[PDB]
RNA sequence: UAAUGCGAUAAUACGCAUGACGGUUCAUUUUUGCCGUGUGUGGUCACGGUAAAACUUAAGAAUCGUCCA
RNA sequence: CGUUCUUCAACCAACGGAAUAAAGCUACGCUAGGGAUAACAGGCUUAUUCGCUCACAGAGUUUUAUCGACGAGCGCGGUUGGCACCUC
RNA sequence: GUUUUUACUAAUUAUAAAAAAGAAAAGCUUAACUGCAAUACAAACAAUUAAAGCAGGGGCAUUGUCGGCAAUAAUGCAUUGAAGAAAUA
RNA sequence: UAAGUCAGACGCAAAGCUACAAGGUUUCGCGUCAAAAGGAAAAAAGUCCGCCAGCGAGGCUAAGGUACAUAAA
RNA sequence: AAUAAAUAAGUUUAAUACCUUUUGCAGCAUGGACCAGCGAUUAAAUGCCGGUAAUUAGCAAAGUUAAACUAACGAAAAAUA
C-alpha cells in the first residue's frame, strides 16, 4: 500500500488513496474468515490427538 | 557462574577423566577437518632446543645434528 | 465412518453402466 | 473420533513473503498453489501452522 | 515475542532495568521553577503519544481542562493562553498550571546549506499526552469554566474537554 | 576481587549468639545436596560439664572456649577426621570463635582457611 | 536478525510419492525391500512409473 | 559478531559432544517412541475411486 | 539462597538454581507415561539424584488413574531405565531422597536388587543413625512402609531405625503412628518389645485423630499384636467404630466388622451391618474385601432373610468378578458352603451363579488343579448339594 | 590458539620435532604418523606417483596398529576397503619386494583376517624360498619371526616351502631370542608334518637355556605347545617351565596365569595351590577375563576340583561375569571408565559353541540355578535365555538337546524362565 | 532461632520477656490498561510478556508504642 | 668481516608509516573525461513570503463605520531559501 | 608483591564494581622475573585481548598467593642506525 | 570462483540530521526493482496478484470486477 | 517503429526502433544516409591447477646426465589341547 501524497510520482490519483468499494470490503471479509477458520481447525486437532503417532511412508527415507 | 561435572561427580578422581577427554577432543577435530589441514610444521631444518623445550628463536650458526665427533 | 463409507462405494460397478444389459437398477448408485 | 492426520493446501505464492515464512513452507514440502500434503497430527506441526494461517488452508 | 538469545536469558548484564521514557506510563511530575537548560536535545524528547493512565483525576481543584489528543506546544502559545484564561475567569480566581515548556528546539538561519553541525537554541516546547489535564480552577462556577474552555479552544491545535471532580 | 569458590567435603562452621558459641562439622557430597552433621558441640554442653566439677563464670568464658575445642578434637579423632576447612563469615571474627580455633590448632587438628 | 526463539523442533512427517527424477532407482528399491509390506509400499509409491521390467522383477 | 566471517561455534560444540559420547557411555538404552513405532502406511484415509 | 549465618548450615548451604526448577516442572507437567519418557530422553545428560527421586514418585501418581488395568508397559520400561540411575548414584542420595525412591518403586510392585537395597540402607546404618534426625515426619512414614513392602529383612537396619525413632513417637501425627504400628505387627522380631509398647501407648491418646483407612489398619494390627488389652487401644478403637459405624466407607466398615467378629465380641448389630452392604455391593468391594465380608457375616452367623437376601447378592457379585488365584476361589467356595445355602437342587438358588462361574473357570484352568485342590472342591460341591458330576443349571 | 585459524588444534611438540628435520623420508613419516584409516588413504592418494615397495610394506603394517586402536569390534568398512586397494599394489610390485618387506606385508594383512589370493600368495612364497633360501641369511631375527607366524596364519601348507625354510633357519635357532624361538615352536606344533622331525627337537633343545628370558605371554604359549609336542618331557622344558611358574605364580598377569593353570590341571599335576589360585580371580574378575579366558578358568578350576567356599564364591561371581559379557551392559562410573574394564567395550556376539561349552561346564560344577531364589548360576542362564531368544534361527535339534541336558542337570526342567 | 533478640557502664551472671490492641515497612493469570512480534487500506486480526512502568482486596512476617481495652 | 640473542633511538600526529628531501601563478593557456558535480532555465519541498477563516483583546466611544492583535488552522507557488532529479 | 590488626567503607574524565572484599596504619620484600604453554574471545589480513598448566631461581605466609597497578584510554609496522653479550670465520 | 561486484532505487515501518519538509540525507527490519515477461488501478521500473521450455478455437481460479464503452447478476 | 493475430474480406483487436550508458531512457542523453569489401585476447619461454596416455625421462649404445625415493615405537597370538 502507499499513503504518501507528495512527490512527482503518482502512486495514487489526485486526492490520495481512494476508499474501498463494496466488493473490496466483501473481499477482505472473506480473507479473514478463512484465516479464522484455519485456527478453529487446529483447535479441533489438538483436542482429539491420539496416543500413538501414525507412521507415513516416504520413498526417500526408505532409500536412506 | 558454575561449571558442573558430567555426572555430578565431585570426587578428586574426576581430574584424570577430564585430561583424557581433552586428548580425545583434539583427535575428533583432526578427523573431521581432514589430512590437508596441517596442524604441525614440517621444515627442511630442525628447530633449536632450549631448557628441554622447543624454541622458535634461532642460534648463531646452523649445524646438522650428530654429524660431528669429539675434538 | 471411513470404513463404513469405503465399502459402499466399493460395492458399485460403474463400468457396468456401459454394458448393454442395463436397466433402471444399474444407475441406482446411491441408495441401493 | 481421533484426528490422526491433517491435509494442508497452499493458497498463496512465494513472491512477496518473508524469508522466515518460506522456510516453514519448504519444511512442509509445498511448492505449488493448490498442491496438497498429508502430515501427522503432532504438537510441533500445529505450532508451525499457527505462524502462517494466511498462506494455506487446513482441514 | 522478545528479541534475545538463550545466553541473554540467563546472563544478561542489564541488571538495573528502566522502562524507556517514550513508552513509560507514569504520569509526569508537577512543574518546577528550575532555570531553562542550554543543552541541545533530540527531537524525540519533545514528543510522546502514549495515553495517560486510566486512573487520572483532578488533584487540587473542582474543574479543569484536558487534552483529547497528543500535541507539542511552544512557549509562546502557553503565554497567550495564560493571559486569555486570567482575563476571562477573574482576578479573584484560583488557577493551577500543570504544564511548562522546557525542551529546547534549534534552528538555522536562511541561506545555510545542510551540514556543519547542529544549530543553536531558538525556543522551548512541551509534549502533551492524550487525556492529560492542563489547567485546574477553583473559586468559580461551572458556567465560568465553560467560558474559559470556549475562549482557548480556537487558540490550540488539539481538541479539548471539561473535567469535574465528584 | 572475590576468589572463585572451591568445593570441600568437610567444613567447619561457627554460630556466635548473644549467649553461646556453636561449632559444627558437616560432610558434603555435592553443592546441590544437603550435608550430614558429624559433630555438634556448643558452649552450653561445656558449661554443664565444667560447672559440676570446676565452677565457671558463664558459658562465654575462656575456660568454656578451651573445653569446646577439646570436645571437638575428641569427636574428630574418634571418627578419623584430621583436616577441615573453615567457613569464613562475620561470626568467624568473634573473639570467642578465635579462641576456640587457636585451641584446636594447638591440640593437633589441622584447620585451613583456603 | 532473530525471528524465532528456541531450539528447532522435529521436522514434520509428510507422506510422499516417488518423483520422476528417481525412476532409475526402482530396481534398487525392490532389492532392498526386506518384507512383503515394504515391497507393497514401494510399488504403490512408484505406481505411475511402473514398467514391465519392474513387474517381472517384483514377482521374482 | 560484527565480523562477516562465518561462525565456527556449531563445529566447536559438535567436537565436544562427540568426544564425550565416544568415551563416556550413556545410562539409558531404550526410547519408548522407537519401541512402539508402527509400520509405515501410505495414508490415513481410504483412497478415492476413479 | 542466603548468606546469613544460622543454626542449620546443613540446609542453608544447599545451592538452588533456576535450571533445576525448570526440569522439575517438566516432570510434574507430564500427563502420561509416554510423555514422561520423552521428557527424560531429552534431559538424559542433566539428571541428578533429586530428579531421579522425583521421577519415581511420578510413576506412582501416573498409575493411580489406571485403577483397573495392571501396570502398563511404558511404566515398566521407565522403572527399568530409572534403576540404572539409582545404581550410578547409589552413594549420592540423602535420607529424604532414599525415602521417596523406595515408595515410588514399591507402588509399581517392583522389586529392587538385593545388592542395591543393601547399599541404600547405609543411610540409616552409617553414622550411628545421625541422618535419621535430618528426616522429617513424612520421610519416616515412607521409610517404614517402603522398606517393609520391598521385603527387606535386616535386624541391624530395623534395630537402628527403631532406636532412633523411639523418642519422637509421641509427637508424630496419628496416621504416621498407625503406619509404624502396622509394620511392627508384620515383623516377628519386634513383637512384645519396648518399641511396640511405646508405639501402642503413643497411639492411645491419638485414636480420635486417625483417618478411616489408617484407623482400620491400626485396629487390625492391634488385635493381632496385643490379644489382651494391656494398652487400651482395642477398647477405644471399638468405641469409635460404634459411634461412627455408619460414617465410614464400606471397605473400612467391612474391615472393622471382621476384626471385631474374630475377637469374639459379636453383638446383635448384623441388621445395621447388612444394609450398607446391599446399598453398595457392586462397588467399593474388591475380591479381597468381599472375602472379609463373607467371613465376618458367616462367623457372626447371620441367616438369609426374605427382605434382604445378602448372600444371594454376594454370590452374584462374586460371579461377576470371576467372569483369579485358585486359592481365593477355593476359600470362597468353602465359605459359601459353610453358609448352609443350596445351589444345585433349586432352579433359582442364591449360590447357583457362583458355582456355575466356578465350573467355567476351572475348565479353562484344569492344569492348575491338583489332587488336593480337587478334593477340597469336591467337599465344597458335596456340601452345597452338587455331586452328580454335572454342570450347574445356570 | 594464535598460530592457526579458529578450531585447528595446536601443534604437538613431539610430532613437530619428527617432521621438522634436515633428513629426507617425508612420505614414510606421514604414513607412519597416520591416526585413522581415512587419513592414511588420503596420504596414499595424494602420493600415488611416488609410491614404492617400501611405502606399500609400511602401509600394510599400519593396518595392524589401526585395528588395535579400534578394539571391541570387528574390522570396520574403511579398513576393509583400504586393504583391498593395497593388494593391487602388492601384485604390481610382487617381483620387487625383499624378504624383509614380504614379511611385513604378510603380518599386516594376516592381523586383519584378510586372505591373500592363492596366486599372489604363491608368488610371495616363491620370493622367500628362491635360491634355496640363500637370501634368508641376510635377515634379522624379527624378519624370520614374522615369516613363520605370518604364513602360518595365512594357512600356507606347502611342504617344500616349510622344508626349505626350516633348513635355512635351523643353524640360527641357538642364537635367536627366547620370544623368537617361542614363535617358531608355536608354528611347529600347528604343522603336523613337522611334529617328529629333527627341526622340532632342535627347537626344543635350543629353548632350554633361554626359558628365563621368555615374556609372560610367550612363556604361557610355550608351555602349552611343549605339553602337546613332548608329553614325555625328554627335553626337560616342561620341568623348567613348571618350576618358573611355581616360583613366579603371582608375578604374571591374570590371563597368563589362567592359561598356565589350565595346562597344569590337564597334565594331572594338581597340587594344593587352589587357595592361592582363587584369590587372584576374584580380585580381578571384571577385567582381564574375556569370554574365552572365562571358559578356560572354569575348566581348570573344575578339573582341579576346587569347591565353592563361603568366604569366596568364585563360581557365583563367574556366573555374573558371564551374564554381563553376554548381555553387554555398560557402566558410566568414572572408575570403570578409567579402569578400561572389558565389559564396557560394548556388545560382541559370541559363537553358540562357547555358550554350549559354558553351559555344560556350569552344569558339571554341581551348583543349582533354578530352585534357589539367589543361586550362583542363576544370572548366567537368565542371560542365556534372553540371548538365545534373539537368535533362534541358529538353534537346531542337536543344540536344543545339548542345552536341555545342561538345563536338566542344573535343575531347571519345568519350562519356565530363570528367576533373575 | 528462648543455647533467639535487644540494652543507656553493654561486657552479658543481671535488666526487658513468646499474648493482646494500634500505627508504620514489606486470588478463576486479583483484572483492566499498556508494550512486543507477525499479518494488515493505516485495526471487527492472532499469540505472548509486564520478577520493566499505572492499577484491587486480603492474610501473614519484621521492628516500634503501650498497667490492656 | 659476517650471524644470533638481550635492547633502544630518529622522522613517521596526513598516526597501515616509505620515490631521501621539498612552495606558488595562469584572464596567454592546452588535452582526456562528467549532467557521477556547480552557475541560467524546468522539477520536488513550502521553512520563509503572500492570501483567507476562526479569534473581537485593544483603539474609535453605543455599534465589527473604520483601523486592528496575541494565538491556531488551511490554501497559493509570484519573495528569500533547501535538495541535486533532466541537459556539459 | 605479600602477612597482621579495625570505633573506617571512599575516590577517579565518567560510572548502582567490590564485605572474606577494599582503604588506611605496622612489618618484611622486588614476580614491574628466566624458558615454554592447552584452550578461547575477537578479527579481511597485519597485529590486538584473556589464560589453566610445566621446569628453574625468588618474596611474604606456612601451604595459599605473586608473570605490575579495581576495570574500560596514556600509542607506531618494516627498513636504517646504535649498545650489551655470545658463536663462527 | 586467484571469476564478477565495492555509483544503487523506492514502498511500508522506526530513529539521528533538516523545519516531527523534500522523489533530501545518514543508519536499521522486511519486500520489490536492479536482472522479471503476464493480469488489476488511465499511461504505470520500486504499489496489489503472480514467476514466461514450445504449440492448441479445452477447463478451474487469484488480485480486481459483474446496466454502455467492456467479458460477467 | 508501418507490423502482428484473426476475418463473412466490409473490418476488428494488440502494439512508443536498435545500440551504448545508467538507480532509472520511446527518450527532449550517445552513435549510425544506404550497399559491397576490410576491421580487434594472437605467438614464444616459464609457473600453477584439471583432463588423456606412457609406466621414470634424455642421450648414448654394458655408461652416463635429469628427476624421484631413502626409520617411523618391530605393537599381531584368531590352538573346541
Ligand atoms: K505477491
Ligand atoms: K595517510
Ligand atoms: K550543459
Ligand atoms: K537505401
Ligand atoms: Mg510526475
Ligand atoms: Mg476474490
Ligand atoms: Mg576540452
Ligand atoms: Mg544529477
Ligand atoms: Mg543521492
Ligand atoms: Mg589473524
Ligand atoms: Mg610458594
Ligand atoms: Mg596482579
Ligand atoms: Mg570505491
Ligand atoms: Mg559505495
Ligand atoms: Mg533518495
Ligand atoms: Mg546495472
Ligand atoms: Mg468460473
Ligand atoms: Mg457485456
Ligand atoms: Mg543520471
Ligand atoms: Mg548523427
The DSSP code sequence of H22-44 is: HHS--S----HHHHT----BS-S
Q: Which residues contact J405 (CB under 8 A, 6 or more apart)?
A: J360, J363
**Nearest CB neighbour to I114, from listed J331, J333, J374:** J374
| Longest distance between any two alpha carbons in chain E, whole Å | 65
Residue nearest to nucleotide M86 (CA to C1'): B60
Residue nearest to nucleotide N60 (CA to C1'): D34
The conformation of residue B29, written as its DSSP 8-state character, comes to H
Query: Across the strands, what pairs with E103?
Result: E125
Q: Which residues of G touch H40 (CB under 8 A)?
A: 38, 41
Residue J121 dihedral angles phi and psi, to the nearest 5°: -60, -35
CB of F68 within 8 A of CB of F41? yes
Q: Which residues of H touch B21 (CB under 8 A)?
A: 19-20, 23
H49 to chain C, any CB pair closer than 8 A? The answer is: yes
User: How far apart, in whole angstroms, are the C-alpha atoms of residue I134 and residue F34?
Assistant: 10
User: How far apart, in whole angstroms, are the C-alpha atoms of residue C3 and residue I134?
Assistant: 63
The whole-angstrom distance between H43's CA and the closest CA on chain B is 40
Coil, strand or helix at J396:
coil
Q: Which residues contact H48 (CB under 8 A, 6 or more apart)?
A: none
User: How far apart, in whole angstroms, are the C-alpha atoms of residue J101 and residue J52?
Assistant: 11
Ligand 8 mean position to E113 CA, how many Å? Answer: 18
Residue J406 dihedral angles phi and psi, to the nearest 5°: -65, -40
Question: How many Cβ atoms from other residues are within 10 Å of residue G46's Cβ?
Answer: 21
Contact H42 G37 (CB under 8 A): no
User: How far apart, in whole angstroms, are the C-alpha atoms of residue J312 and residue J309?
Assistant: 5
The DSSP annotation for J85-108 comes to HHHHHHHHTTTT--HHHHHHHHHH
Count of positions (residues) in chain A: 64
Rounded to the nearest angstrom, the gap between the alpha carbon of residue E82 and the centroid of all alpha carbons in its chain is 15
- How many residue pairs bridge chain H and chain J with CB atoms within 8 Å of each other? 16
Measure, in angstroms, how far nucleotide L69 C1' is from residue E69 CA: 28
A1 to chain D, any CB pair closer than 8 A? The answer is: no
Coil, strand or helix at E140:
coil
For H16-40, b/e burial (b = at least 16 CB within 10 A) is eebbeeeebbebeeebbeeeeeeeb
The whole-angstrom distance between G2's CA and the closest CA on chain D is 10
B3, B5, B22, B28: which to substitute to probe chain H, counting the most H Cβ within 10 Å?
Answer: B28
Residue E133, H or E segment: strand E133-138
User: How far apart, in whole angstroms, are the C-alpha atoms of residue B71 and residue B64?
Assistant: 17
CA neighbor of E64 nearest in space, from E139, E165, E150: E165
C8 to chain H, any CB pair closer than 8 A? The answer is: no
The conformation of residue A56, written as its DSSP 8-state character, comes to B
Q: Which residues of A touch G46 (CB under 8 A)?
A: 59
The alpha carbon dihedral of B18, B22, B28, B33 has a sign of: positive
**Cell representation of residue J58:** 609400511
Q: Which residues contact G26 (CB under 8 A, 6 or more apart)?
A: G18, G42, G46, G49, G50, G54
Residue B64, CA distances (Å) to B40, B61, B67, J23 in order: 21, 10, 6, 9
Query: Across the strands, what pairs with E94?
Result: E138
**Helix, strand, coil percentages, rounded to 5, for chain J:** 70, 0, 30
Look-up: residue for cell 574375556?
J290
CB of H15 within 8 A of CB of B32? yes
Q: Are strands E63-67 and E133-138 parallel, antiparallel or unpaired?
A: antiparallel
CA neighbor of E28 nearest in space, from E124, E105, E132: E132
User: How far apart, in whole angstroms, are the C-alpha atoms of residue E47 and residue G47?
Assistant: 68
I2, I4, I5: which to substitute to probe chain F, counting the most F Cβ within 10 Å?
Answer: I5
- J228 CB contact with strand O at below 7 Å: yes
CB of J186 within 8 A of CB of J221? yes
Residue J10, CA distances (Å) to B37, H14, J32, J406 in order: 12, 18, 20, 59
CB of E122 within 8 A of CB of E36? no
Query: Scanning every residue of chain F, which has its alpha carbon at the shortest distance from the alpha carbon of B7?
Result: F30
The alpha carbon dihedral of B51, B55, B61, B65 has a sign of: positive
- How many residue pairs bridge chain A and chain H with CB atoms within 8 Å of each other? 19
The conformation of residue J347, written as its DSSP 8-state character, comes to -
Ligand 5 mean position to A14 CA, how many Å? Answer: 12
The whole-angstrom distance between B62's CA and the closest CA on chain H is 40
For J230-286, where are the alpha helices, taking DSSP H only? Answer: 237-247, 254-266, 274-283
Q: Which residues contact I381 (CB under 8 A, 6 or more apart)?
A: I355, I387
Residue J374 dihedral angles phi and psi, to the nearest 5°: -130, 90
D39 to chain G, any CB pair closer than 8 A? The answer is: yes
Q: List the nucleotides on chain K closer than 7 A to a protein CB.
A: 1, 3-7, 11-13, 32-42, 44-49, 52-55
Q: Which residues contact I73 (CB under 8 A, 6 or more apart)?
A: none
Half-sphere exposure of J151 (CA within 13 A, CB side): 29
Contact J331 H25 (CB under 8 A): yes
- B15 CB contact with strand L at below 7 Å: no
D52 to chain G, any CB pair closer than 8 A? The answer is: no
- J183 CB contact with strand O at below 7 Å: yes
Chain breaks in chain H (C to N over 2.5 A) after: none
Residue I240 dihedral angles phi and psi, to the nearest 5°: -65, -40
CB of D2 within 8 A of CB of C1? no
G1, G2, G15: which to substitute to probe chain H, counting the most H Cβ within 10 Å?
Answer: G15
Query: Scanning every residue of chain C, which has its alpha carbon at the shortest distance from the alpha carbon of H44?
Result: C2
Coil, strand or helix at F15:
strand
CB of I59 within 8 A of CB of I78? yes
User: How far apart, in whole angstroms, are the C-alpha atoms of residue J100 and residue A40?
Assistant: 81
CA neighbor of F15 nearest in space, from J303, A46, E55, I5: I5
Coil, strand or helix at A36:
helix
**Cell representation of residue F47:** 558449661
User: How far apart, in whole angstroms, are the C-alpha atoms of residue I285 and residue I310?
Assistant: 14
CB of I172 within 8 A of CB of I139? no
Three-state DSSP string of F91-113: HHHCHHHHHHHHHHHHHCCEEEC
The whole-angstrom distance between B59's CA and the closest CA on chain J is 16
The DSSP annotation for E94-128 comes to EEEE-----EEEEE--TT--S-SS--EEEEEEEEE
CA neighbor of F73 nearest in space, from F43, F40, F98, F108: F108
User: Nearest 10 degrees: CA dihedral of I332, I333, I338, I340?
Assistant: 120
**Helix, strand, coil percentages, rounded to 5, for chain E:** 25, 25, 55
The DSSP annotation for J121-152 comes to HHHHHHHHHGGGGGGGGS--HHHHHHHHHHHH
User: How far apart, in whole angstroms, are the C-alpha atoms of residue A33 and residue A39?
Assistant: 10
Where residue E117 falls (left for φ over 0; alpha for ψ -120 to 50; beta otherwise) is left
Residue F18, CA distances (Å) to F89, F91, F94 in order: 17, 11, 11
User: How far apart, in whole angstroms, are the C-alpha atoms of residue E145 and residue A8?
Assistant: 49
Q: Which residues contact I318 (CB under 8 A, 6 or more apart)?
A: I290, I332, I353, I354, I357
Measure, in angstroms, how far nucleotide M7 C1' is from residue I253 CA: 75
Q: Which residues contact E89 (CB under 8 A, 6 or more apart)?
A: E95, E137, E140, E144, E148
The alpha carbon dihedral of F32, F36, F39, F41 has a sign of: positive
**Nearest CB neighbour to D40, from listed A35, A46, A56:** A56
Residue I235, CA distances (Å) to I219, I223, I229, I239, I241 in order: 10, 11, 8, 6, 10
Q: Which residues contact J334 (CB under 8 A, 6 or more apart)?
A: B7, B9, B11, B13, B14, B17
End-to-end CA separation in angstroms for chain D:
15
**Helix, strand, coil percentages, rounded to 5, for chain G:** 55, 0, 40
A39 to chain D, any CB pair closer than 8 A? The answer is: yes
**Cell representation of residue G38:** 515394504
Q: Which residues of I touch F24 (CB under 8 A)?
A: 9-10
Measure, in angstroms, how far nucleotide N47 C1' is from residue D17 CA: 15
Ligand 12 mean position to F4 CA, how many Å? Answer: 16
CA neighbor of I204 nearest in space, from I172, I246, I174, I167: I174
Residue E64, H or E segment: strand E63-67
Q: Which residues contact I45 (CB under 8 A, 6 or more apart)?
A: B6
Cα-based angle J182, J188, J193 (whole degrees, multiple of 5): 175
Rounded to the nearest angstrom, the gap between the alpha carbon of residue H6 and the centroid of all alpha carbons in its chain is 24
Chains that touch F (3 or more CB pairs under 8 A): B, I
**Cell representation of residue D38:** 498429508
The approach used to solve this structure was: cryo-EM
For J271-289, b/e burial (b = at least 16 CB within 10 A) is eeebeebbebbeeebbebb
Coil, strand or helix at D42:
coil
Coil, strand or helix at B54:
strand
End-to-end CA separation in angstroms for chain C:
18
Give the sheet arrangement for strand D36-40, strand by strand: D36-40, D5-10, D56-58
Q: Which residues contact I315 (CB under 8 A, 6 or more apart)?
A: I336, I350, I351, I352, I353, I354
The conformation of residue E7, written as its DSSP 8-state character, comes to H
For J267-351, where are the alpha helices, taking DSSP H only? Answer: 274-283, 291-304, 314-327, 334-339
User: How far apart, in whole angstroms, are the C-alpha atoms of residue I288 and residue C30?
Assistant: 58
CA neighbor of J355 nearest in space, from J418, J399, J414: J399
Residue E164, H or E segment: strand E160-164
For I244-304, where are the alpha helices, taking DSSP H only? Answer: 250-262, 270-279, 287-300
Question: How many Cβ atoms from other residues are within 10 Å of residue J25's Cβ?
Answer: 10
Ligand 10 mean position to I337 CA, how many Å? Answer: 97
The whole-angstrom distance between B7's CA and the closest CA on chain H is 10
Residue F13, H or E segment: strand F10-16
CB of J403 within 8 A of CB of J387? no
Query: Across the strands, what pairs with F11?
Result: F26, F85
Look-up: residue for cell 625354510?
J165
Q: Which residues contact G37 (CB under 8 A, 6 or more apart)?
A: H39
CB of F85 within 8 A of CB of F10? yes
Amino acid at each position: 500500500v502507499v499513503f504518501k501524497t507528495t512527490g512527482g510520482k503518482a502512486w495514487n490519483p489526485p486526492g490520495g488513496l481512494k476508499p474501498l468499494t463494496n466488493t473490496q470490503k466483501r473481499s477482505r471479509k472473506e480473507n479473514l474468515q478463512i484465516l479464522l477458520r484455519n485456527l478453529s481447525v487446529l483447535k479441533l486437532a489438538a483436542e482429539n490427538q491420539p496416543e500413538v503417532t501414525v507412521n507415513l511412508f516416504s520413498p526417500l527415507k526408505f532409500m536412506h | 557462574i558454575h561449571v558442573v561435572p558430567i555426572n555430578d561427580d565431585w570426587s578428586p578422581e574426576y581430574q584424570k577423566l577430564a585430561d583424557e577427554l581433552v586428548v580425545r577432543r583434539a583427535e575428533v577435530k583432526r578427523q573431521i577437518l581432514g589430512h590437508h589441514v596441517h596442524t604441525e610444521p614440517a621444515f627442511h631444518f630442525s628447530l633449536p632446543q632450549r631448557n628441554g623445550n622447543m624454541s622458535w628463536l634461532l642460534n648463531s650458526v646452523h649445524k646438522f645434528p650428530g654429524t660431528t665427533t669429539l675434538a | 465412518x471411513x470404513x463404513x463409507x469405503x465399502x459402499x462405494x466399493x460395492x458399485x460397478x460403474x463400468x457396468x453402466x456401459r454394458x448393454x444389459x442395463x436397466x433402471x437398477x444399474x444407475x441406482x448408485x446411491x441408495x441401493x | 473420533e481421533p484426528v490422526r492426520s491433517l491435509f494442508v493446501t497452499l493458497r498463496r505464492s512465494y513472491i512477496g513473503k518473508a524469508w522466515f515464512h518460506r522456510e516453514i513452507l519448504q519444511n512442509f514440502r509445498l511448492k505449488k498453489i493448490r498442491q496438497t500434503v498429508e502430515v501427522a497430527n503432532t504438537p510441533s506441526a500445529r505450532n508451525s501452522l499457527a505462524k502462517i494461517p494466511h498462506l494455506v488452508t487446513i482441514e | 515475542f522478545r528479541r534475545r538469545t538463550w545466553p541473554a536469558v540467563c546472563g544478561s548484564l542489564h541488571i538495573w532495568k528502566k522502562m524507556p521514557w517514550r513508552i513509560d506510563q507514569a504520569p509526569p511530575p508537577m512543574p518546577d521553577s528550575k532555570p531553562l537548560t542550554r543543552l541541545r536535545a533530540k527531537r524525540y524528547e519533545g514528543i510522546k503519544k502514549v495515553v495517560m493512565p486510566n486512573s487520572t483525576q483532578l488533584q487540587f481543584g473542582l474543574y479543569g481542562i484536558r487534552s483529547m489528543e497528543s500535541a507539542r506546544l511552544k512557549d509562546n502559545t502557553l503565554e497567550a493562553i495564560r493571559r486569555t484564561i486570567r482575563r476571562k475567569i477573574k482576578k479573584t480566581g484560583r488557577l493551577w498550571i500543570m504544564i511548562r515548556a522546557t525542551v529546547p528546539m534549534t534552528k538555522k538561519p536562511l541561506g545555510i546549506r545542510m551540514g556543519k553541525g547542529k544549530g543553536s537554541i531558538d525556543h522551548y516546547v512541551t509534549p502533551i499526552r492524550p487525556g492529560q489535564i492542563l489547567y485546574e480552577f477553583d473559586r468559580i462556577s461551572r458556567p465560568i469554566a465553560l467560558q474559559a474552555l470556549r475562549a482557548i479552544q480556537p487558540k490550540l491545535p488539539c481538541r479539548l474537554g471539561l473535567v469535574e471532580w465528584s | 576481587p572475590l576468589k572463585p569458590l572451591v568445593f570441600r567435603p568437610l567444613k567447619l562452621f561457627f554460630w556466635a549468639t548473644n549467649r553461646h558459641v556453636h561449632a559444627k562439622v558437616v560432610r558434603f557430597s555435592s553443592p546441590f545436596n544437603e550435608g550430614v552433621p558429624v559433630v555438634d558441640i556448643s558452649t552450653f554442653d561445656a558449661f554443664n560439664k565444667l560447672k559440676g566439677s570446676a565452677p565457671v563464670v558463664a558459658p562465654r568464658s575462656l575456660e568454656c572456649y578451651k573445653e569446646v575445642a577439646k570436645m571437638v578434637k575428641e569427636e574428630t579423632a574418634r571418627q578419623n577426621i584430621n583436616e577441615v576447612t573453615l567457613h569464613l563469615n562475620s561470626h568467624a571474627s568473634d573473639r570467642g570463635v578465635r579462641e576456640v580455633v587457636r585451641e584446636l590448632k594447638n591440640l593437633g587438628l589441622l584447620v585451613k582457611k583456603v | 536478525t532473530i525471528f524465532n526463539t528456541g531450539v528447532p523442533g522435529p521436522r514434520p512427517e509428510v507422506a510422499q510419492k516417488l518423483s520422476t527424477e528417481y525412476q532409475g532407482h526402482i530396481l534398487r528399491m525392490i532389492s532392498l525391500a526386506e518384507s512383503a509390506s515394504e515391497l507393497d509400499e514401494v510399488l504403490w509409491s512408484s505406481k505411475k512409473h511402473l514398467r514391465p521390467v519392474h513387474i517381472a522383477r517384483s514377482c521374482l | 559478531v560484527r565480523t562477516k566471517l562465518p561462525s565456527k561455534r556449531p563445529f566447536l560444540q559438535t567436537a565436544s559432544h562427540l568426544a564425550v559420547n565416544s568415551l563416556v557411555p550413556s545410562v539409558r538404552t531404550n526410547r519408548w517412541a522407537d519401541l512402539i513405532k508402527g509400520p509405515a502406511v501410505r495414508s490415513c484415509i481410504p483412497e478415492i475411486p476413479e | 539462597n542466603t548468606g546469613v549465618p544460622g543454626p542449620r548450615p546443613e540446609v542453608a548451604q544447599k545451592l538452588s538454581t533456576e535450571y533445576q526448577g525448570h526440569i522439575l516442572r517438566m516432570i510434574s507437567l507430564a500427563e502420561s507415561a509416554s510423555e514422561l519418557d520423552e521428557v527424560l530422553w531429552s534431559s538424559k545428560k542433566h539428571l541428578r539424584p533429586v530428579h531421579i527421586a522425583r521421577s519415581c514418585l511420578k510413576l506412582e501418581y501416573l498409575r493411580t488413574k489406571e485403577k483397573g488395568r495392571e501396570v502398563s508397559e511404558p511404566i515398566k520400561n521407565l522403572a527399568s531405565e530409572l534403576e540404572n540411575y539409582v545404581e550410578l548414584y547409589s552413594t549420592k542420595f540423602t535420607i529424604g531422597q532414599v525415602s521417596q525412591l523406595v515408595r515410588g518403586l514399591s507402588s509399581i510392585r517392583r522389586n529392587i536388587q538385593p545388592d542395591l537395597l543393601l547399599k541404600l540402607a547405609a543411610v540409616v546404618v552409617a553414622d550411628d543413625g545421625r541422618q535419621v534426625q535430618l528426616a522429617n515426619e513424612m520421610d519416616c512414614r515412607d521409610l517404614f512402609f517402603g522398606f517393609f513392602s520391598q521385603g527387606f529383612d535386616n535386624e541391624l537396619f530395623w534395630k537402628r531405625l527403631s532406636e532412633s525413632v523411639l523418642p519422637r513417637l509421641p509427637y508424630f501425627n496419628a496416621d504416621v503412628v498407625s503406619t509404624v504400628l502396622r509394620v511392627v505387627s508384620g515383623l516377628r522380631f519386634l513383637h512384645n518389645t519396648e518399641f511396640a509398647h511405646a508405639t501402642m501407648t503413643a497411639l492411645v491418646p491419638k485414636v480420635g485423630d486417625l483417618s478411616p483407612a489408617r484407623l482400620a489398619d491400626a485396629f487390625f494390627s492391634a488385635s493381632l499384636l496385643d490379644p489382651t488389652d494391656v494398652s487400651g487401644l482395642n477398647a477405644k478403637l471399638e468405641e469409635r467404630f460404634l459411634r461412627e459405624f455408619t460414617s465410614f466407607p464400606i471397605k473400612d466398615t467391612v474391615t472393622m466388622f471382621q476384626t471385631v467378629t474374630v475377637r469374639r465380641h459379636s453383638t446383635p448389630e448384623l441388621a445395621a451391618q447388612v444394609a450398607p452392604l446391599v446399598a453398595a455391593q457392586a462397588h467399593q468391594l474388591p475380591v479381597r474385601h468381599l472375602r472379609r465380608a463373607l467371613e465376618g457375616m458367616v462367623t457372626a452367623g447371620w441367616k438369609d432373610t426374605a427382605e434382604i437376601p445378602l448372600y444371594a447378592i454376594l454370590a452374584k457379585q462374586a460371579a461377576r468378578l470371576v467372569l483369579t488365584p485358585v486359592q481365593l476361589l477355593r476359600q470362597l467356595a468353602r465359605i459359601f458352603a459353610n453358609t448352609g445355602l443350596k445351589a444345585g437342587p433349586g432352579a433359582n438358588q442364591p449360590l447357583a451363579p457362583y458355582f456355575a462361574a466356578l465350573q467355567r473357570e476351572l475348565e479353562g484352568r484344569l492344569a492348575e488343579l491338583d489332587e488336593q485342590v480337587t478334593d477340597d472342591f469336591a467337599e465344597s460341591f458335596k456340601k452345597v448339594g452338587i455331586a452328580e458330576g454335572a454342570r450347574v443349571q445356570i
